[PDB]
Design a protein around this ligand. Structure first.
Ligand SMILES: CCCOc1cc(C)c(F)c(C(=O)NNS(=O)(=O)c2ccccc2)c1
Ligand code: NA
Ligand SMILES: [Zn+2]
Length: 268
């Protein structure tokens, strides 16, 4: 029997996938998780006692982004091993393709939280390899179900690319992406490139956005905005065609913006 249900904060959440919590934890009808330190527990009573005792009111690591009540914490896998292991076990409940949960030292984790009077409440995260040979600026990215499709995933996607910009590099999320992950990345890519085309070669768009040329090309192909000439993809769009796409339905929800002014981060 596997963990099939968790209590975290004020949410009960059904699992989507197997995650390798220890066997005696999976046998319980429900797993209880401290929303601040991510300690997982077998019983409501041990959960209630921990809450009265736990002094954490936010993730560990350093707050590298804060605007109003939106906050991002950078957490090194080597400095906060247990925390990051528990984060990975949590994420695996909602990610089919994640495979790494206990060797967290090669990773840095970026925790998105939403703050109120009580503390900084975890929304989701993405992990990133400290040294990515394949040029991946995201290893795994996960939004907890009650926060999905509400702008938090787009924020985190945009955030990963702001780091890539500061690193003077391009990057792409590690594949395979989840079903909702694909739609989210394609929508973010379209929004960003269409906005830049409204306000340029494919190499220019890549340097301005840190989106890889392949991801730019595949996105422009889905928008039918690229011509092919003698082995080279070429951007072929009229300023009116861009506006037609942009005012369409799906680009109407107001995003949580990444304000680079509020991002306190220096590249390694
Ligand atoms: C738990 C498994 C998957 O977890 C995720 C992962 C990602 C990358 C997500 F983006 C989301 C998510 O919630 N997307 N919807 S969205 O934020 O409103 C959005 C709107 C427009 C353009 C992009 C995103 C959930
Ligand atoms: Na649920
Ligand atoms: Zn705790």
């Amino acid at each position: 029997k596997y963990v099939d249900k968790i209590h975290i904060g004020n949410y009960e959440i059904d699992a989507w996938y197997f995650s390798p919590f220890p066997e005696d934890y999976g046998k319980q009808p429900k797993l209880w998780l401290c929303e601040y330190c991510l300690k997982y527990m077998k019983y409501e009573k041990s959960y209630r006692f921990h809450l009265g005792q736990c002094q954490w009111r936010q993730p560990p690591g350093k707050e590298i982004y804060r605007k109003s009540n939106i906050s991002v914490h950078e957490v090194d896998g080597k400095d906060h091993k247990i925390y990051c292991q528990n984060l990975c076990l949590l994420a695996k409940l909602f990610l089919d393709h994640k495979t790494l949960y206990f060797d967290v030292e090669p990773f840095v984790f970026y925790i998105l939280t939403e703050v109120d009077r009580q503390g900084a409440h975890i929304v989701g995260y993405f992990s990133k390899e400290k040294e990515s040979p394949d040029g991946n600026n995201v290893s795994c990215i996960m939004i907890l179900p009650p926060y999905q499709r509400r702008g938090y995933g787009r924020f985190l996607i945009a955030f990963s690319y702001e780091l890539s910009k500061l690193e003077s590099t391009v990057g792409s999320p590690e594949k395979p992406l989840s079903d909702l992950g694909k739609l989210s990345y394609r929508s973010y890519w379209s929004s960003v490139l269409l906005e830049n085309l409204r306000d340029l070669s494919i190499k220019d768009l890549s340097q301005m956005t840190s989106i890889t040329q392949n991801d730019i090309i595949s996105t422009l192909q889905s928008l039918n905005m690229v011509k092919y000439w003698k082995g080279q993809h070429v951007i072929c769009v009229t300023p009116k065609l861009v506006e037609e796409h942009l005012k369409s339905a799906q680009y109407k929800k107001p995003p949580i913006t990444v304000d680079s002014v509020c991002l306190k981060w220096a590249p390694p």
